[PDB]
Design a binder for this molecule. Structure first.
Ligand SMILES: c12c3c4c5c1c1c6c7c2c2c8c3c3c9c4c4c%10c5c5c1c1c6c6c%11c7c2c2c7c8c3c3c8c9c4c4c9c%10c5c5c1c1c6c6c%11c2c2c7c3c3c8c4c4c9c5c1c1c6c2c3c41
Ligand SMILES: c12c3c4c5c1c1c6c7c2c2c8c3c3c9c4c4c%10c5c5c1c1c6c6c%11c7c2c2c7c8c3c3c8c9c4c4c9c%10c5c5c1c1c6c6c%11c2c2c7c3c3c8c4c4c9c5c1c1c6c2c3c41
Lengths: 30, 30, 30, 30
């Protein structure tokens, strides 16, 4: 199930990217 | 500063997502 | 400005990646 | 091949996010 594990990992990485992006967007408002 | 750091981190996270995605795409070909 | 717009676009693109990833993960379960 | 198509789409979306992120990071240098 390397495929499944890879997609689960990619999803988690994307989640991390998203939350950092929101921090950056807030920083820019400021 | 925090914005720059957040974008740097997001880029690294996206790179990790991309490499996992490539593994997954190869897995499906098999 | 351009930075804000770029981050907005990146977030939308990440959202699209996430929803496709979820479809893919369901496809593999099947 | 909905799974394959989904991953190909997600990869393209991530590519778009990456290129916008690089624009944003350059904007911040400035
Ligand atoms: C977010 C978390 C994660 C993301 C969110 C982003 C911002 C903020 C939070 C949050 C905390 C989280 C997580 C964690 C990650 C993660 C990411 C994410 C980015 C974002 C930036 C900010 C922002 C602050 C926010 C705090 C907050 C802490 C939280 C922690 C961790 C942790 C860790 C990661 C990591 C990254 C990285 C990004 C960077 C941004 C900034 C700042 C900083 C804030 C801090 C710090 C905390 C701390 C660390 C690191 C670390 C650093 C770094 C970046 C820095 C930076 C800062 C701090 C670092 C560090
Ligand atoms: C990038 C392209 C794409 C990304 C790169 C980012 C920046 C720049 C280029 C580039 C051109 C690309 C693509 C295209 C996308 C895409 C994205 C990406 C982001 C980035 C930002 C900048 C930046 C400029 C740069 C030019 C450049 C043009 C190029 C085109 C398209 C096109 C289109 C998308 C779209 C997004 C969006 C982002 C946003 C950023 C900025 C600005 C703007 C620059 C322009 C403009 C051009 C134009 C459009 C749109 C559009 C807008 C918008 C964001 C804006 C914004 C600007 C322009 C918009 C528009």
């Amino acid at each position: 199930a390397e495929a499944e594990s890879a997609l689960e990992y990619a999803q988690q990485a994307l989640e991390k990217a998203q939350l950092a992006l929101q921090a950056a967007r807030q920083a820019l408002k400021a």
